[PDB]
Design a protein around this motif. Structure first.
Motif, PDB file in Angstrom:
ATOM      1  N   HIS A  27       7.100 -21.496  -2.291  1.00  0.00           N
ATOM      2  CA  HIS A  27       6.745 -22.832  -2.756  1.00  0.00           C
ATOM      3  C   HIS A  27       6.841 -23.859  -1.629  1.00  0.00           C
ATOM      4  O   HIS A  27       5.954 -24.694  -1.470  1.00  0.00           O
ATOM      5  CB  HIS A  27       7.659 -23.257  -3.905  1.00  0.00           C
ATOM      6  N   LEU A  28       7.927 -23.809  -0.874  1.00  0.00           N
ATOM      7  CA  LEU A  28       8.142 -24.751   0.222  1.00  0.00           C
ATOM      8  C   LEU A  28       7.337 -24.356   1.462  1.00  0.00           C
ATOM      9  O   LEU A  28       6.615 -25.173   2.034  1.00  0.00           O
ATOM     10  CB  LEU A  28       9.632 -24.824   0.569  1.00  0.00           C
ATOM     11  N   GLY A  36      -0.659 -22.943  -6.639  1.00  0.00           N
ATOM     12  CA  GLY A  36       0.371 -21.981  -6.295  1.00  0.00           C
ATOM     13  C   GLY A  36      -0.146 -20.561  -6.157  1.00  0.00           C
ATOM     14  O   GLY A  36       0.086 -19.914  -5.137  1.00  0.00           O
ATOM     15  N   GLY A  37      -0.836 -20.075  -7.179  1.00  0.00           N
ATOM     16  CA  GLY A  37      -1.370 -18.726  -7.149  1.00  0.00           C
ATOM     17  C   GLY A  37      -0.279 -17.672  -7.088  1.00  0.00           C
ATOM     18  O   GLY A  37      -0.359 -16.731  -6.303  1.00  0.00           O
ATOM     19  N   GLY A  74       0.748 -17.832  -7.916  1.00  0.00           N
ATOM     20  CA  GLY A  74       1.846 -16.880  -7.934  1.00  0.00           C
ATOM     21  C   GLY A  74       2.923 -17.200  -6.913  1.00  0.00           C
ATOM     22  O   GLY A  74       4.099 -16.930  -7.140  1.00  0.00           O
ATOM     23  N   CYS A  75       2.508 -17.777  -5.796  1.00  0.00           N
ATOM     24  CA  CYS A  75       3.408 -18.154  -4.700  1.00  0.00           C
ATOM     25  C   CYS A  75       4.581 -18.999  -5.188  1.00  0.00           C
ATOM     26  O   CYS A  75       5.717 -18.820  -4.754  1.00  0.00           O
ATOM     27  CB  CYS A  75       2.596 -18.936  -3.664  1.00  0.00           C
ATOM     28  N   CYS A  78       1.191 -24.186  -3.182  1.00  0.00           N
ATOM     29  CA  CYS A  78       1.954 -24.748  -4.290  1.00  0.00           C
ATOM     30  C   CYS A  78       1.864 -26.269  -4.322  1.00  0.00           C
ATOM     31  O   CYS A  78       2.848 -26.957  -4.600  1.00  0.00           O
ATOM     32  CB  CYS A  78       3.408 -24.289  -4.206  1.00  0.00           C
ATOM     33  N   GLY A  79       0.672 -26.771  -4.048  1.00  0.00           N
ATOM     34  CA  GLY A  79       0.426 -28.193  -4.048  1.00  0.00           C
ATOM     35  C   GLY A  79      -1.048 -28.483  -3.888  1.00  0.00           C
ATOM     36  O   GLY A  79      -1.439 -29.478  -3.285  1.00  0.00           O
TER      37      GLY A  79
END
Length: 22
Positions: A9-10, A21-22, A1-2, A16-17
Motif C-alpha cells: 500500500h505504501l 490497489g489491485g 490487491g496490492c 493503492c491511490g
C-alpha cells in the motif's frame, strides 16, 4: 490487491491511490 499488503500500500501508493490497489 496490492492494498492487502501494508507494505505494498505504501510502497506502491501509485497503485493503492489510483489503480484501485489491485
Amino acid at each position: 490487491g496490492c492494498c492487502s499488503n501494508p507494505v505494498c500500500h505504501l510502497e506502491h501508493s501509485n497503485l493503492c491511490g489510483g489503480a484501485a490497489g489491485g
